[PDB]
Amino acid sequence: KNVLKIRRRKMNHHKYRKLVKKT
Amino acid sequence: NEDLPISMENPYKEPLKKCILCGKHVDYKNVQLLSQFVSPFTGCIYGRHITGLCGKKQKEITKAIKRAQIMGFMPVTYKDPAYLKDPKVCNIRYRE
Amino acid sequence: DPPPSTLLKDYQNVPGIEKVDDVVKRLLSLEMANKKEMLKIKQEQFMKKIVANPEDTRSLEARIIALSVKIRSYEEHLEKHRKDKAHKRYLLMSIDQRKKMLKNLRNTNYDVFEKICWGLGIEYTFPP
Amino acid sequence: ATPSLRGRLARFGNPRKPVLKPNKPLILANRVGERRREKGEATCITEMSVMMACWKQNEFRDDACRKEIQGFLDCAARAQEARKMRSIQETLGESGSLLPNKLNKLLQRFPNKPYL
Amino acid sequence: PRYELALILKAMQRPETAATLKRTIEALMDRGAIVRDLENLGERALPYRISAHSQQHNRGGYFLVDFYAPTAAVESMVEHLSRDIDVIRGNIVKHPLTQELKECEGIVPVPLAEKLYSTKKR
Amino acid sequence: YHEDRIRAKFYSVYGSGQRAFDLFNPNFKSTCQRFVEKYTELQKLGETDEEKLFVETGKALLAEGVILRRVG
Amino acid sequence: RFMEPYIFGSRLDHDIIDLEQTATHLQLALNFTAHMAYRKGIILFISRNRQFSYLIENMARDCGEYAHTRYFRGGMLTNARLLFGPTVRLPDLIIFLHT
Amino acid sequence: REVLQLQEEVKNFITRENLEARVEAALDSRKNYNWAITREGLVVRPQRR
Amino acid sequence: AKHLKFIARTVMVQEGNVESAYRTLNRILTMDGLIEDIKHRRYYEKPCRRRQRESYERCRRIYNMEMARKINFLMRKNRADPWQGC
Amino acid sequence: KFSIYPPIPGEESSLRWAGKKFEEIPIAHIKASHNNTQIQVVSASNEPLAFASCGTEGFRNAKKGTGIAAQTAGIAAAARAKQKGVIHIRVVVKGLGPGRLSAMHGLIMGGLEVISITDNTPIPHNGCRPRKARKL
RNA sequence: AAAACUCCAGUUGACACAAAAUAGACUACGAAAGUGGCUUUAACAUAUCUGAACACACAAUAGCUAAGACCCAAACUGGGAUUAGAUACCCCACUAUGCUUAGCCCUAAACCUCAACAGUUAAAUCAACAAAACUGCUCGCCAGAACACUACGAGCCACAGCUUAAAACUCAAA
Numbered sequence A: 001k002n003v004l005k006i007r008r009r010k011m012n013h014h015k016y017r018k019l020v021k022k023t
Numbered sequence B: 001n002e003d004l005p006i007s008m009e010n011p012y013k014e015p016l017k018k019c020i021l022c023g024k025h026v027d028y029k030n031v032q033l034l035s036q037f038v039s040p041f042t043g044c045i046y047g048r049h050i051t052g053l054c055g056k057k058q059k060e061i062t063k064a065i066k067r068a069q070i071m072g073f074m075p076v077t078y079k080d081p082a083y084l085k086d087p088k089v090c091n092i093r094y095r096e
Numbered sequence C: 001d002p003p004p005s006t007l008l009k010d011y012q013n014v015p016g017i018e019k020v021d022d023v024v025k026r027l028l029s030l031e032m033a034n035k036k037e038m039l040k041i042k043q044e045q046f047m048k049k050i051v052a053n054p055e056d057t058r059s060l061e062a063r064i065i066a067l068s069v070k071i072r073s074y075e076e077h078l079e080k081h082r083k084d085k086a087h088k089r090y091l092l093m094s095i096d097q098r099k100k101m102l103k104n105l106r107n108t109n110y111d112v113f114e115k116i117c118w119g120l121g122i123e124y125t126f127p128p
Numbered sequence D: 001a002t003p004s005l006r007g008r009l010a011r012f013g014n015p016r017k018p019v020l021k022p023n024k025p026l027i028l029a030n031r032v033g034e035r036r037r038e039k040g041e042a043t044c045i046t047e048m049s050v051m052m053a054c055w056k057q058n059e060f061r062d063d064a065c066r067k068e069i070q071g072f073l074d075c076a077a078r079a080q081e082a083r084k085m086r087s088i089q090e091t092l093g094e095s096g097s098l099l100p101n102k103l104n105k106l107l108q109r110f111p112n113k114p115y116l
Numbered sequence E: 001p002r003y004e005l006a007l008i009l010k011a012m013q014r015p016e017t018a019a020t021l022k023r024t025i026e027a028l029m030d031r032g033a034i035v036r037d038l039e040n041l042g043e044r045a046l047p048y049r050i051s052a053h054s055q056q057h058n059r060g061g062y063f064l065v066d067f068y069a070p071t072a073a074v075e076s077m078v079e080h081l082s083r084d085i086d087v088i089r090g091n092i093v094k095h096p097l098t099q100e101l102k103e104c105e106g107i108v109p110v111p112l113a114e115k116l117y118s119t120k121k122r
Numbered sequence F: 001y002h003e004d005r006i007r008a009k010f011y012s013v014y015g016s017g018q019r020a021f022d023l024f025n026p027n028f029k030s031t032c033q034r035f036v037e038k039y040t041e042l043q044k045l046g047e048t049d050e051e052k053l054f055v056e057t058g059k060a061l062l063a064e065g066v067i068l069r070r071v072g
Numbered sequence G: 001r002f003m004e005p006y007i008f009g010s011r012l013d014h015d016i017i018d019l020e021q022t023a024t025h026l027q028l029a030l031n032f033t034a035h036m037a038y039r040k041g042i043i044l045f046i047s048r049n050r051q052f053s054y055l056i057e058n059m060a061r062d063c064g065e066y067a068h069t070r071y072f073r074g075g076m077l078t079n080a081r082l083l084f085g086p087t088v089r090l091p092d093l094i095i096f097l098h099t
Numbered sequence H: 001r002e003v004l005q006l007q008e009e010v011k012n013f014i015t016r017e018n019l020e021a022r023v024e025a026a027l028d029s030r031k032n033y034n035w036a037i038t039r040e041g042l043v044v045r046p047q048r049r
Numbered sequence I: 001a002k003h004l005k006f007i008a009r010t011v012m013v014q015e016g017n018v019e020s021a022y023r024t025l026n027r028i029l030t031m032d033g034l035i036e037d038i039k040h041r042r043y044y045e046k047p048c049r050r051r052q053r054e055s056y057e058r059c060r061r062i063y064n065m066e067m068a069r070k071i072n073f074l075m076r077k078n079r080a081d082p083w084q085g086c
Numbered sequence J: 001k002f003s004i005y006p007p008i009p010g011e012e013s014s015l016r017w018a019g020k021k022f023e024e025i026p027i028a029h030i031k032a033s034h035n036n037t038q039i040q041v042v043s044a045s046n047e048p049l050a051f052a053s054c055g056t057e058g059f060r061n062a063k064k065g066t067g068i069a070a071q072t073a074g075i076a077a078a079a080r081a082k083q084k085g086v087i088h089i090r091v092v093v094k095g096l097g098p099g100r101l102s103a104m105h106g107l108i109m110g111g112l113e114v115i116s117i118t119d120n121t122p123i124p125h126n127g128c129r130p131r132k133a134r135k136l
Numbered sequence K: 001a002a003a004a005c006u007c008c009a010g011u012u013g014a015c016a017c018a019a020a021a022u023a024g025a026c027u028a029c030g031a032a033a034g035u036g037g038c039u040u041u042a043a044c045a046u047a048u049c050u051g052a053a054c055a056c057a058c059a060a061u062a063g064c065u066a067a068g069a070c071c072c073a074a075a076c077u078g079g080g081a082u083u084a085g086a087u088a089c090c091c092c093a094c095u096a097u098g099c100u101u102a103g104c105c106c107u108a109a110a111c112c113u114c115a116a117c118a119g120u121u122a123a124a125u126c127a128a129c130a131a132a133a134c135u136g137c138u139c140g141c142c143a144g145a146a147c148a149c150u151a152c153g154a155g156c157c158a159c160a161g162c163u164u165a166a167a168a169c170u171c172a173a174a
Ligand SMILES: [Mg+2]
Pocket: D022, D023, D024
């Protein structure tokens, strides 16, 4: 319903966490 | 002419029913009064619609019950065996 | 600071001072009273010594004295009890309200303002 | 007696916290819910247990202890036939029982008017 | 403020009971309080097994000690009662005669809380 | 009106009368109507105590003829 | 809601309809229905009520009028072009004894 | 009126000399503040049984 | 368990009526709230879920009481057919 | 007539069972859980007489939470208790499960009479934290 | 169904430094978060209102330092069933953690998503849901989406973060 933006923000946050965890 | 309706105090009003212990004082020393509202089986405390009180009365009753149970004047897991012949006030349903 | 045996307000303007013995005088004093009685006694003494008429309760002077005694009580509580956030916020709000009342009084009447600042000892500072 | 809901639902004139937060609005409909039915019974267990016990005690032939197995079979047959005959031929009863049809008919006779 | 104390013993009847009562009276007197009266509820059974302090206790006597305690002596009295071995337990509760009764009318038929939804039909 | 309070006090003291209300008759004078008429015709005189007027009306209706079989 | 200036007062949660303005509006209604039937009018008693459905239908038959205390379908007086026929004279006056 | 009531009530306290008699009177007495109520609100004392 | 023994939750059996006493004890436990309490405490219960289910049970009880009152009020006209046709 | 409450250990206990009162009756504690139950017969002066469970007859997994095994264990315990010399007992229920009345029926059919049916459910008042809610 | 242990369980007598069923069909206190076994004390501000990201203070839970404690639950881990594969849903044991002291970034769907000061609804009438709609003032924000709970800059008893906060490109949308 209205959770697509929240899931996109969650995916972006997870990608940023993976990036800051890699290096 | 002078038979007009007059808005007065509105009669036909009987005195509102009060609590069974509103006119008396509730203390923790009275073990029988605070134990009569306890189920003589599981030792559970009856609610408001079972005893027939309001807010302040039920609050004072449960406060006195907890005080007597902590200080050591009334059991919590059951009812006092010496006070089992008290008049039944609350409504039951078990044992038909 | 009133002594522990100084006779409060509720049993002050009553006939028969020396008619009682010692136990009655001790039970009706601050020995078997409360902190609210001491606060009321301090407020009455301040309103009788500092300002003129100690009868007006809706005046600004009574409000200032009440805020001052509440600030003193909160400071004593924070000195006795270390960790206390709600009382600290209450003390801060009381200090802010007292400063605002002193500002308003100085804006409307400088005589009673300087009288209060000389009696209670506090001084209204200018906020930067 | 029903408890009042003065400060229950979160409305514009409630300067406190809502305690009851229902999913559906507190507006009754015009139909009654269906009665509970179709449950698992699995009655007669002690009789089967004692029958198996008396079978294991003696030999496999039912001549040494025929009374126990005969009574077990009689009780099981009586219970099964009674339940079947009841659920097949009788569903009303006496005064006050399973009454959904007339209940919903009376509810539709005097429905609710929420639209003023 | 007036307070009351419930003393619980462990079978001594007269001598040790009177000794402990005199000791408690002297303590309340020299600590900074005034003793009003001293009553006794009797010698009945305990509602539960008290194996708190020493070994078994299932039969004690209840007492009532009414006095006027200040504000810096109830803790000392509780500590003295906890250090003493004769007394099992006892709380210094306030006297109920300070708080009087109000003008409560009992129960009241609450109405139906309406004005909660709009006039929609859905 | 005041007659409502009079009838309320009458029902609180005594209760329902032995006569049955006949709503078919437009001018049906029941026990309460006769009682309130006696009360107002005695009040039209000039007294201030309501208990005296009440007991006087009661004694008058008792000595007249109708006997209100009240409760114990 | 639309029933406040037509009530004189209440009597123990029982509203009393005032007969002052009632008789005023009644004569204006009887006079309106009198001139309609005088100029060859058609009345219709539409009162769906299961208590006096026999007395209403007989008073219209003895006087040569029309009654309707039965169930109301759909396209009666509204869709009269495809139900009762081509051109049908609709009743110019309907009496609602039970709304 | 309140201070007169307090002065009249203070005449029955416990002093330094009244200790043995007080403890004897306390041990020779049994006070029970137990009383139940019924559906109306009566007072029933277990001491009368 | 520092109280007594055969006093708390104890019934009697007369003429060998064991099933009757068992049903009585079960009804007492269901009315005093014990079986459902044990079923809830069988696993860990979240406080949010606890308050949500409490509000749900309260709303359901209120709705059931309202429906019961409506049924008891409307059972005055579900007799028979007073007027035929009409 | 006939008080449903248990008699006080007091004086004058006016019920007789095989020439004995109510306090001098051996107790039968039963801990019925969700998949296994145990039945023990203890005398009045606290002496163990018999003890078994669902696994003492040959049942492996799953079948222990069945009323048949509970009734068998109850009958076995009743027989072991009768081998010594007891008549009247007092059943004690501890916990709920599928075998809550099966043990009682087994003790009844074994040759033992019950007069009091008590239950001491070990349920705390917001005490210890149970296991987390599993995801079914 | 495994697997986990046999110094395993059962009635009796002797035991705790977080966690207070029923009362709770109660609506309370507190600015919010939050809080309901008992005993005692201090105490829940402001006589018009509003008003900081130019400031101060409080503030769900989790994570750190050193000491005191550990029944049970449990990040991780080890072992054990199913599946072609299971680092998850099925079972047991265990570490940090739930507790108190003094010092830390102040984090949420911090949701009743509805700011406070007052009143009104037969003069006022609303896209649709949701919890019906307005009049007078004020604080911060908006005016197309991802890019972006993002580098830098400005501060933080901290260097895997928090507060404020974009450009370039694509799209005729969202
Ligand atoms: Mg919903």
